[model samples]
Target: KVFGRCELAAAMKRHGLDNYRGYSLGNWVCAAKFESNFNTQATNRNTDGSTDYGILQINSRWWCNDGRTPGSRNLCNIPCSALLSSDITASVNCAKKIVSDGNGMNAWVAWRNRCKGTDVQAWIRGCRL
Candidate 1:
């Protein structure tokens, strides 16, 4: 599903992205907008031969196992395919773990570029959450 802005915000909130690891719901929402344009099935390949998966674009190099990324740590211990599911629970959980890894929200380049130190509340402005 390609989530609308408010819809993504609410879904993210429901999965506990709100204020998770000091990253606000707006931050998560904003990152998602730039990361995958709120598309659940989005995927991108990194130049290093790794793939990013799902709405938040969790990396196959560390977060999930795609069997092709060399030395994949699979820190989230999940199949990369799960990240692309229409239901985002797996992706959300993995994203939380990514931020908790001392990198905070900086693990996501999209978040760093679009959400860091910026006004993010607009991402969820009309969400009745």
Candidate 2:
């Protein structure tokens, strides 16, 4: 729905996620790129029956409530569908909470597996921000 990378970075920058909580915005972007490809309407099912929601691919097993079900924790206190919007305020807030949990970006397996210890700045390679 957006320009994929640059526009998504712009949105993330505007949202103040750039290097948020001691982690680079590039980490979030790279993980999101692999996770959802920057499309906010993205959703995927994990093998464990928990669904990953939106850009950061938050899991229903812990973070948000999926339709027709309640969250195991609902740590973000929002429905999983809320993260499925292009307007990612809720998603960003939720992601911050997860990061603030002292896990950094490790909560997102995509980030841990792909973005961690890697030069994620390339994720913003041409973003010019």
Candidate 3:
């Protein structure tokens, strides 16, 4: 339910996510746009029965708690349901932890599959952070 790239960027910047960990704002913006369209409550049921959560499309595997009900190694140590929030605080923190695990943005398949080498100047073009 979030609106405007500038607002999303500002929120991320507040959490130090504006290129905080060697990744660029464009990478995140592009991934977010494609992953969940900035919808904090976004979720997707993969063909494998696992689910992706929040704007980053964090997989149930190795991150959120969806064990037998779905997927992951549960490394994030947070529940998947926590990610579906308007505040986005929990998801942001979990996302930071995921990137901190040496995986970088590669942790998100959406980023790798759709955004990795794509130029996303338009993602932040009209935004003034």
Ranking by lDDT: 1, 2, 3
Q: Whole-model Cα lDDT per candidate?
A: 0.91, 0.83, 0.79
Q: Whose TM-score is higher: candidate 1's or candidate 3's?
A: 1
Across residues 84-112, which tens digit of lDDT does each residue of candidate 1 receive?
A: 99899999999988998997988998789
Ranking of candidates on TM-score, top first: 1, 2, 3
Clashing pairs in 2: 19-25
What is the per-residue lDDT of model 3 for residues 24-96, given as tens digits with 9 covering 90 to 100? 7777778888888888878888887788888888888678896555435777788888888777677788888
- Superposition TM-score, candidate 1 onto the true structure: 0.97
Using TM-score as the measure, name the better of candidate 1 and candidate 2. 1
Residue range 1-129, candidate 2, lDDT tens digits: 443787788788888898899888788789889888888888888877788888888888888988644446789999999999879888888998899987788888778888899998888887767
Candidate 1 displacement at residue 112 in angstroms: 0.8
lDDT of 1 at 42: 96
Which of the numbered candidates is closest to the native, going by highest lDDT?
Answer: 1
